[PDB]
Amino acid sequence: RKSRITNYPKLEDANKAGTKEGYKCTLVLTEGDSALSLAVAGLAVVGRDYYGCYPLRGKMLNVREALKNAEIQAIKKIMGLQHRKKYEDTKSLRYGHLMIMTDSHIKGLIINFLESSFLGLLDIQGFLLEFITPIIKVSITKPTKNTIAFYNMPDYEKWREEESHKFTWKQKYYKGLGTSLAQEVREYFSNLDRHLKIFHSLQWLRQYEPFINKELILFSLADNIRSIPNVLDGFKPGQRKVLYGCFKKNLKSELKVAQLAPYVSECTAYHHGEQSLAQTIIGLAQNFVGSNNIYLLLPNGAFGTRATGGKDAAAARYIYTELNKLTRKIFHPADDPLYKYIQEDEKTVEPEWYLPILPMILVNGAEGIGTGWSTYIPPFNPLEIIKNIRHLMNDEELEQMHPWFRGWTGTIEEIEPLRYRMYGRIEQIGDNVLEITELPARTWTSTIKEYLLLGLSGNDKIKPWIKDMEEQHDDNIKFIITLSPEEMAKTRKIGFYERFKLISPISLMNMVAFDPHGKIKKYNSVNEILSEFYYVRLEYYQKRKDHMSERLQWEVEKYSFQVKFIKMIIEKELTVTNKPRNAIIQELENLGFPRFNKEGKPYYGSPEELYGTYEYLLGMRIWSLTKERYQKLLKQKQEKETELENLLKLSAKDIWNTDLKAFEVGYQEFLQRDAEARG
Amino acid sequence: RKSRITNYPKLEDANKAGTKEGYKCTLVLTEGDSALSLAVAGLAVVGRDYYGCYPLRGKMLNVREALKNAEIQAIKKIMGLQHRKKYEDTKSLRYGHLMIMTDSHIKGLIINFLESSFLGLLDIQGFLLEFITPIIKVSITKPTKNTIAFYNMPDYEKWREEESHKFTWKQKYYKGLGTSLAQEVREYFSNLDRHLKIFHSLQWLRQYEPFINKELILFSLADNIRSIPNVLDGFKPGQRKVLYGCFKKNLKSELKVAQLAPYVSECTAYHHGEQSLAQTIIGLAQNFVGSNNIYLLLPNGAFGTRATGGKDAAAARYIYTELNKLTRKIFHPADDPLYKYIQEDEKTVEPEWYLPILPMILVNGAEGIGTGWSTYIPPFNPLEIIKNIRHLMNDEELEQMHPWFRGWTGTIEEIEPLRYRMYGRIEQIGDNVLEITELPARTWTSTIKEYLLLGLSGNDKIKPWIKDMEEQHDDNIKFIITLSPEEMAKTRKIGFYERFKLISPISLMNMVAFDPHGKIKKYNSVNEILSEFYYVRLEYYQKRKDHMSERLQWEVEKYSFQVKFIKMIIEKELTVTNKPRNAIIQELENLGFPRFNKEGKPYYGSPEELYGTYEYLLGMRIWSLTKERYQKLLKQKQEKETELENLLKLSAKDIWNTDLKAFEVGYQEFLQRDAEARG
Known part of the structure; x- marks a missing residue:
């Protein structure tokens, strides 16, 4: 009506x-x-x-x-x-x-x-x-x-946490400003x-x-920065922020991945355009064959299995994680004062880059897709990486390194430089019975079972070529497959490895990363990556030594003057008792006692934080004047002198190899402790 | 088929x-x-x-x-x-x-x-x-x-935060165990x-x-504990936890109500059955006429208006809050060491109850519904409350106190003991024109406008009795209503206050709370509540004095012996230099120097935390031996002695009134600063 x-x-x-x-x-x-x-x-x-x-x-x-x-x-x-x-x-x-x-x-x-x-x-x-x-x-x-849209930030944040892990995503350039407004309105209606x-x-x-x-x-720069890793540590700013947050919190015990996330996010100004923080944490801890050669974080829970490539990981709230015992032997704390911490909004965040003792981008490799740039670097054997580091230290020729996966057991072959063919393993255990005990490194079990089911119970436009199939996967792969004599004969003709899809390629033709200077680069060889890293690490070992020696020297002077001060009062050559402040400050200055600031730096001569104070002397407890305590001060002085001399006896390479040795020990332990965990 | x-x-x-x-x-x-x-x-x-x-x-x-x-x-x-x-x-x-x-x-x-x-x-x-x-x-x-159900905790938690504020709710007894399983299954299907x-x-x-x-x-006890407040502070454990969390964090600046919540929850083992934490925070800060006479927390944002009774408050994330400058003058920090902090799972939480200087349950009142018990106590004038406190201190008769709302301007009349009639205000400003400038305390503007709209544009079964209505509400109430001569005459017959619903009752017949001992009680008068509070506060003022004097005395002894120790070394009556540890400990003990533990308690005589150490002496800086520093130590000693004597000159009531006076000053300021804010 x-x-x-x-x-x-x-x-x-x-x-x-x-x-x-x-x-x-x-x-x-x-x-x-x-x-x-x-x-x-x-x-x-x-x-x-x-x-x-x-x-x-x-x-x-x-x-x-x-x-x-x-x-x-x-x-x-x-x-x-x-x-x-x-x-x-x-x-x-x-x-x-x-x-x-x-x-x-x-x-x-x-x-x-x-x-x-x-x-x-x-x-x-x-x-x-x-x-x-x-x-x-x-x-x-x-x-x-x-291109799913989000009309207000919170909607984005929820999808990012509860949904981003299901799709391979990135943010696109969108102003939604002028000419595109017409279509925006249509999409709305x-x-x-x-x-x-x-x-x-x-x-x-x-x-x-x-x-x-x-x-x-401005958007393409940030995307590449978020997408391509730095050659020195093999990290992307997101992963780096996480590690930095873990080092920052001084974690001794485990935390839920849901608990650690907001900590890293608040502590590191984690950008919103970045990947899910929890997802980044889980990636860093994944320990199934095909993931990390060395997982810096520990997967205390279901962080994903080999079956789906970690896509079946539990929720952040249900999983815990902590630093791997080996991580601090890779990222040496003595190097921390050397790094250039990025300054964002009056807060200092993670370093431009970390400088592990061995190339982490070669150990675990990297993968990412940015705008105009993309990268893929397979994992390599850390044992071999260290060997090449030593070759460089001793001016010896480098040995070629080929991809290598932790806990994997197939075979890799070079068909030509920068091109490989990775094989799983399939043997005939009886007449018409072939068992599969290994699959190519990044081939997930789900992919093979579904291929087996498809050929077993043929689909439209492809008829049954497999007779019977049976999974007996304990923690290792094991597909028992039975065929018909006619199909077994065609498997020999087409090929057992080709027919069961047990061959996958590895390409080193797109090993891209940011160099030590922050400018994107494509490396034409693995040795090229290792060498670029080497010279920067070598330099920083000299920097570490210099940073350590300068401070030890300062301590030697501090103890020397502390012992002098105490000794002089002991033998009544100097009296502090009832003497005015200014009288003692002048008396100490005239005797040649230097001032010490908060950082422990000495300042000799007549003039704050720029000069320091005599607080290291007059601030000592009366206990210091006593016997045992004074003898203790004498021993600290002597031990500090010995500590400095011990350091000055070592070269930058001597310290590096000391770390390398300390890593080798911990790594063998990491290896057994890892094979024991998942086996 | x-x-x-x-x-x-x-x-x-x-x-x-x-x-x-x-x-x-x-x-x-x-x-x-x-x-x-x-x-x-x-x-x-x-x-x-x-x-x-x-x-x-x-x-x-x-x-x-x-x-x-x-x-x-x-x-x-x-x-x-x-x-x-x-x-x-x-x-x-x-x-x-x-x-x-x-x-x-x-x-x-x-x-x-x-x-x-x-x-x-x-x-x-x-x-x-x-x-x-x-x-x-x-x-x-x-x-x-x-009775909405929740099959797993998280579903409950989400509803609690994002939905609980819309319905007046409570948890019911539910095991979903045996006999009720049949219906549970039907409800599921x-x-x-x-x-x-x-x-x-x-x-x-x-x-x-x-x-x-x-x-x-066990469930009925917890419900009453969550629902009925304690008579001493007028708080329910939930509100108490919030205040405790604010005192605990030592907040100087504001925080989002969404930010403060998880802090209080982690810090106080805030139960899940309790009301929404953010909602509890907003309630504590609401400052519209009808809410808090004294809001302990500051409403820095939209915490709700008089129009809907705060039901139109913004989201926790959009509003900020901080402690009211006056709150710490009400809850005196010198009383903190006196409280009995509840021990839950190896963590100490909020006190069984706080002991404000004046009865907060009378200042702001209380309201709640538990199982078998319910309570309602209207707000009273704090000025009058203090007057009655002083009457008690001076053994003078108490004066009766009637409900009173901050910033309200109507009139309240006692019809009989424990029964009142609250009036708004309506005057005739012309022929057939009546303006309403005030409404009963807890009557929300929305309720009156809708009543005006209903009588203006009659509903089914009720015909138009109002001619024209107009709102000119600035920050104050102002309904300009025009009527027909025949309806104006019937308004005089039925009554202007009754017809426009400008009268609402106040009942003091259900003033229930937990006494100082934790046992539910019904109070038959306001003076009964004030008196019960008084004797406990009076007692704790003696406790405060005693707690303060005992410690000041300890400090007097500490300084006395510190001055003795320094003086003796100054005049060479005692030497510490190069003397063995055990030799000095024995020498100090023989001279009569007491030991001091971490809490500052002295222990005289020959024997840890049970005895203490001579660390207060030998732990002094060498600076102490000097002139100015020693003279400073002499002044601290003297000032500490004077501080103790000054305290011992005061009675428990002298200290209470000192606090009362300090409150009066801050309260007048709170009052102007509040009238200035919303006016």
């Missing part, structure tokens, strides 16, 4: 407004010429059956101060709003929803009118609605490409129309109503 | 299983005789059209070790599972869902079979399903009674059937597959 509006010419009344289905219709109020064009653009998608359109305001010449009654009547007449009433349902109205488009102060005015005159209206579930432009857009690339269809069928419900190209390159 | 199962007699096949709608049907596998009865009980509710039932196992005589093939065939035949295949949809199956009832190790076996033979099955959205008994049940009492109806219509979706009466009284 369509109640018709005759007094408003500019109104394009929804065909079904004023009818029984009016509660399903939506009225779009527009402000400004451009908002009208957009409303219409959106309406071209959804139609005029359940959508009405009315220009509330046209163009404003005057200026905006922080509702004309004619506008109130328009809204009321069109909406069917009768009298001052407390609304509970929109069944007595011509339209069920109201949308406002502003091109942003008029929305408030309308809101005030509605609340002031019609109480329950704005409190009705999906009544009010507004056009919102998304802040973040994400490129989902695995399960399928589709398109999504909105879907929601209303289901909202009204169920009558569960989410709510809409609860350039300068420099920024393009 | 119903594919029929003929080889399984115990199967009660869903009528629509094996047809086109088989994907809609659900198969319920049962284990044990009791699980069969329950499945059937549930099926009596949902019907046999879309539900099938089959006894997988009957009864087990043997014992459970940590699938018979006959069972595998049964499941396959009935489900229509053909061959080893990777499933993606359940369109080729006889049933779309599978439910297991165990009376709990067989579910795993079935899961293994399904994953091992049919890949994508268990990964399909709503395929697998299981009967889960709820852990928590909540009694929603305002928007309407309904009933809810499950609703979900499946909507799940299949939309083909957005939540998933089911992602006594000793002492415990009844």
